Design a protein around this nucleic acid. Structure first.
Ligand SMILES: [Mg+2]
Ligand SMILES: [Mg+2]
Ligand SMILES: [Mg+2]
Ligand SMILES: [Mg+2]
Ligand SMILES: [Mg+2]
Ligand SMILES: [Mg+2]
Ligand SMILES: [Mg+2]
Ligand SMILES: [Mg+2]
Ligand SMILES: [Mg+2]
Ligand SMILES: [Mg+2]
Ligand SMILES: [Mg+2]
Ligand SMILES: [Mg+2]
Ligand SMILES: [Mg+2]
Ligand SMILES: [Mg+2]
Ligand SMILES: [Mg+2]
Ligand SMILES: [Mg+2]
Ligand SMILES: [Mg+2]
Ligand SMILES: [Mg+2]
Lengths: 150, 103, 56, 110, 117, 140
RNA sequence: CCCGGCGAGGGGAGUGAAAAAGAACCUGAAACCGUGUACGUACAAGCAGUGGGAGCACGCUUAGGCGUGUGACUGCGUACC
RNA sequence: GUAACGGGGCUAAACCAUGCACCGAAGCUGCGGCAGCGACGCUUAUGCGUUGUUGGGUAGGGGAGCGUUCUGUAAGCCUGCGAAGGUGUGCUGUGAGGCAUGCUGGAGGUAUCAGAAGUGCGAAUGCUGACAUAAGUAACGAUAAAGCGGGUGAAAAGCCC
């Protein structure tokens, strides 16, 4: 810490003592012990373990999430307002849900405190799929066998 | 008439007195089944016929009332050597009440 | 002359016994129906009966 | 407040003033002096002042002209003590706390 | 990243400091008491309740020895008479009969006196 | 219920009059010490406050068994250092049975407080019957 | 406005939702220091408690033998690291 | 200062022999309860009732947990018809602690399962701060001591004349 000095307290004598340096972990002055650090944190999951068990949604969350329709093609240039019209084709709104159309078109229109999220693309982790009530898979055909990637 | 018996300690000094005791077995709740004690009776001991035994003829027992068999009591009780301390402990029972009819 | 363990409480609270204060009790004297102080006649004029200090 | 007055600071230590206070309680009131005016200790001159101020509050906060009253309460508390230093044997034996109190006098009904 | 001991700090001291009795001086006012005294209490307690079962027995017999002997046969001979029986054995404790049912008790000393072969 | 007869704070006190003019001397102390506690007594749970009430008479008629008439350490040292220690043989002290000998019961009692309650509180004297400075009423 | 040395300090009145927010000012704990009340306590020896325990002050209940405080007397019994 | 029965006190309250009886520990038994393991009764992921047994413990090994600050679940839930915090109380758990609530309080808190720790103090002649103790004790700094009358002032031994 601001260790602007080495021990100036005279060891033997002066009555109770036994001081030393001043980045001294016991001295209220300063000095924070086993300090700390920036670190990495980021642990890395294997590749196979990454794809392992994801959309278990369909079967379990059956009566909830596993819908596939369309990416809403008729949506205006950049319009989120009347999203409700399309947010009602299933009656899934603030209930959360995310789309997986896979086209960075104008459907990235979903902007709100926290309801509908797009990310419609290969890039997507279960964490999100499980953060929403009914992840509208949609996309259509994109959901193939080994590449059911949305 | 006086009372007398053992069952988990000779607790039967008082006459009817309705004092705690032990516990049934399978469960406690109240009500009853009508359980006569046994002829531990001091002959009941109480009348012109206080008797050395208690044995003053066959069959002589009081019916158990089963007033209230619950509660506990809590007592810390913790030991500790010079390097340890089992200090942290607790063991209690409920001692069913029982009023007991007449001798 | 050092000491070693000393009990602030109780002890000392005992020596304080011989420390409480005390009460006077005196008169007023004929003229002053009050003051007179202690064994004095009166300070108002400092007179026991006349021209003593300042009076009539 | 059932007519009080109390104090704060000035400086006169606690026990010092707590001594003279014991002298006055119970009857009091009509004892605005004599049981106080005839005892000289600094603590005394201080309790009397506030004593009168208190008995004076008997014409403002409440009625009951000065003549009855009781003074059922008088207690001093330790008030923040000033700190200072004291040159001595090179600087070891020096603390000096001035100490101070109040009085808090009261006058209710018997 | 906050120990912020303050958070249980208080609760612990307060817990043991909760020695109603106050005991005396530092024994309540200062944390010093707890594991010093509140701990002793636990120790002195640990042994006394179980060691007590006998301290009363010592009294029970102390009075039986003082009651039964006045009317023939000492406590030493008493339980021996009593000892002989098919069902006749009701232990002591209630043995305090000498205080409320003297007639019973003296009628119980014969159950032993006349009993001693 | 909790069995233990209470402590009616020395409930009853049965008065008595020994003789001491006997021949048992030291032997007598026990049945004199047991008595002021809870000997003949049944109920009145001892250990706690209690006692009885008897009284000695002349007592001057004792000889003990062996040559004890001539022994018995007896000293009543005082807080005086300077080398004190007042040793006097039994016969030397038997000349005036005071707080001692007849008072052989003191060392036989629970000692300290409460036991101290019984202590000399039985009276001693040394002349039997004459002018019983003690309570004349009921005794056996 | 009132006590006071045209002090300090306070007591009212008023501001305020609150001044039990008054400038020492949020919440305000602990050590430590007091006033009041219930009980114990001035012939009794020691880690001060723990086990037993009467009495007393209040609280009990259509008694029913209890709750809270305090604890005379008594068996034990040399703190923690 | 008895001090070479613990004291008393003992002629047997000593010793030797003989036998019975009694006191006596957390030892054993009885009664209730807790936990581990083997079994028994069954039931049968499993589990519970009976039972046999095991449960002193420093270094140390192993195994389970509570609690705190922060993150997710959280503009969800709790709250000014009073949050956190402080203090009492009652119930509850084996314990770490848990909850409910009186009062204070004046604005926030966070079931749950999971995640990460500046993660839990009584000691280190530990560090900082506050308050005790001694104690209203020592001391008030050269032994060149001062007395009086006025003045002023709330008050003068000490200030002005
Ligand atoms: Mg250097
Ligand atoms: Mg030191
Ligand atoms: Mg720092
Ligand atoms: Mg990769
Ligand atoms: Mg005996
Ligand atoms: Mg003893
Ligand atoms: Mg504040
Ligand atoms: Mg007394
Ligand atoms: Mg007890
Ligand atoms: Mg036996
Ligand atoms: Mg035993
Ligand atoms: Mg173990
Ligand atoms: Mg917080
Ligand atoms: Mg430690
Ligand atoms: Mg002085
Ligand atoms: Mg001194
Ligand atoms: Mg001196
Ligand atoms: Mg000078």
């Amino acid at each position: 810490v601001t260790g602007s000095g080495k021990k100036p307290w005279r060891q033997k004598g002066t009555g109770r003592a036994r001081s030393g340096s001043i980045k001294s972990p016991i001295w209220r002055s300063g000095g924070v012990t086993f300090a700390a650090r920036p670190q990495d944190h980021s642990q890395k999951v294997n590749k196979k373990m990454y794809r392992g068990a994801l959309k278990s949604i369909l079967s379990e969350l059956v009566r909830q999430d596993r819908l596939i329709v369309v990416e809403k093609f008729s949506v205006e240039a950049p319009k989120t307002k009347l999203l409700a019209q399309k947010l009602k084709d299933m009656a899934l709104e603030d209930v959360l849900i995310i789309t997986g159309e896979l086209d960075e078109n104008l459907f990235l229109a979903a902007r709100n405190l926290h309801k509908v999220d797009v990310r419609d693309a290969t890039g997507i982790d279960p964490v999100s799929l499980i953060a929403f009530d009914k992840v509208v898979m949609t996309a259509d055909a994109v959901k193939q066998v080994e590449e059911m990637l949305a | 008439m006086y009372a007398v018996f053992q069952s988990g300690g000779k607790q039967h000094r008082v006459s009817e007195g309705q004092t705690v005791r032990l516990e049934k077995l399978d469960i406690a709740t109240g009500e009853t089944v009508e359980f006569a004690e046994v002829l531990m009776i001091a002959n009941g001991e109480e009348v012109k016929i206080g008797v050395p035994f208690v044995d003053g003829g066959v069959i002589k027992a009081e019916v158990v009332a089963h007033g209230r068999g619950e509660k506990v009591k809590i007592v810390k009780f913790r030991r500790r050597k010079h390097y340890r301390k089992q200090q942290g402990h607790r063991q209690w029972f409920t001692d069913v009440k029982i009023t007991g009819i007449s001798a | 002359a050092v000491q070693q363990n000393k009990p602030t409480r109780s002890k000392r609270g005992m020596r304080r016994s011989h420390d409480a204060l005390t009460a006077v009790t005196s008169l007023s004297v004929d003229k002053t129906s009050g003051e007179k102080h202690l064994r004095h006649h009166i300070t108002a004029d400092g007179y026991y009966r006349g021209r003593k200090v300042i009076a009539k | 407040m059932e007519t009080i007055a109390k104090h704060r600071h000035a400086r006169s230590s606690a026990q010092k003033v707590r001594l003279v206070a014991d002298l006055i309680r119970g009857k009091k009131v009509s004892q605005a002096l004599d049981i106080l005016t005839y005892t000289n200790k600094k603590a005394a001159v201080l309790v009397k002042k506030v004593l009168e101020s208190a008995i004076a509050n008997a014409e403002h906060n409440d009625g009951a002209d000065i003549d009855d009253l009781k003074v059922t309460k008088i207690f001093v508390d330790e008030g923040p003590s000033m700190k200072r230093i004291m040159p001595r044997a090179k600087g070891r034996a020096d603390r000096i706390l001035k100490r101070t109190s109040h009085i808090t006098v009261v006058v209710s009904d018997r | 990243a906050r120990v912020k001991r303050g958070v249980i700090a208080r609760a612990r001291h307060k817990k043991i400091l909760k020695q109603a009795k106050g005991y005396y001086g530092a024994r309540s006012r200062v944390y010093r008491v707890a594991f010093q005294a509140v701990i002793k209490a636990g120790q002195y307690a640990y042994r006394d309740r179980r060691q007590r079962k006998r301290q009363f027995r010592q009294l029970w017999i102390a009075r039986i020895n003082a009651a039964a002997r006045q009317n023939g046969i000492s406590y030493s001979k008493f339980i021996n008479g009593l000892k002989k029986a098919s069902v006749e054995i009701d232990r002591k404790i209630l043995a305090d009969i000498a205080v409320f049912d003297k007639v019973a008790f003296t009628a119980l000393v014969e159950k032993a006196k006349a009993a001693l072969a | 219920m909790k069995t233990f007869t209470a402590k009616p704070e020395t409930v009853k006190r049965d008065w008595y009059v020994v003789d001491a003019t006997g021949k048992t001397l030291g032997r007598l102390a026990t049945e004199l010490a047991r008595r002021l506690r809870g000997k003949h007594k049944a109920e009145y749970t001892p250990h706690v406050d209690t006692g009885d009430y008897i009284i000695v008479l002349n007592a001057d008629k004792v000889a003990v068994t062996g040559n004890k008439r001539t022994d018995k350490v007896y000293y009543h040292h005082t807080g005086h250092i300077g080398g004190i220690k007042q040793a006097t043989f039994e016969e030397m002290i038997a000349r005036r049975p005071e707080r001692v000998i007849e008072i052989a019961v003191k060392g036989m009692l629970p000692k300290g407080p409460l036991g101290r309650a019984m202590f000399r509180k039985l009276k001693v004297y040394a002349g039997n019957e004459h002018n019983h400075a003690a309570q004349q009423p009921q005794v056996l």
